Amino acid sequence: GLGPLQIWQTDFTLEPRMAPRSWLAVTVDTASSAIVVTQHGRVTSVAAQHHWATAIAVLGRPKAIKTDNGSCFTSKSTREWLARWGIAHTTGIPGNSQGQAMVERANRLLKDKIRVLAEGDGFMKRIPTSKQGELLAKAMYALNHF
């Protein structure tokens, strides 16, 4: 089984063009570099668990998840959720090259795409709430199935 290991990096990034639910939770699969993004109203332990529930259905269950020391990732709640799934978890510093670099690069790529696509449709500022989901799904498609 010489193929690659199954480890992700996850963080939150603020995108006001997607308000009211302007917090994007972004996951990078470090082996393949596939990106899963979901949209959230607030950053909480539960918004992190919901996102990972989506990412699992999209990429399959990983062996480990690399995050920073954000409370939504260190809460007893989340720790329990991860243990319930059997996914090892490893923290880091906000910006720990070690295990936050890939996903920081990915936040930037994702925001760029969102802007380029939003402006092509004539949305200079905020994206109409009813357009946001299809537009976010198209930015994900682009960055993955490029």
Next chain:
Amino acid sequence: GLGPLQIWQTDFTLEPRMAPRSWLAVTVDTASSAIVVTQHGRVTSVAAQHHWATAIAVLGRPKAIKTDNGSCFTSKSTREWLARWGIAHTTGIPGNSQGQAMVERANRLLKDKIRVLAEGDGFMKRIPTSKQGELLAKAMYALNHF
């Protein structure tokens, strides 16, 4: 490129354990048999487009989509949406073995899983609204990453 063609089958199926948004839109990738499911409040042209927007981000853009003659799939709206993406579309009869059998089998598998999982958590009837998303994502994971 002797590997398989990229064609999907899509339909809607009613699941009251997921009310208020009890309409599940289900897509089968006929080659790999991967399943994408989303949750909807009503079956309309727009709910079909939203679901396919999600499926594209998950499976990539297909060449063709097999559906029945449901209006939400034959509306001028949807026809436009599909053309905008360049996805050929082919209709059928509600239950046309030709191109509705795979996805009918999949509705049944999905409802079974939802029931088995819901009852394991102690939900005999309706699933608490706040549990529905993670539970639907876990039923998808199971049926795909089995």
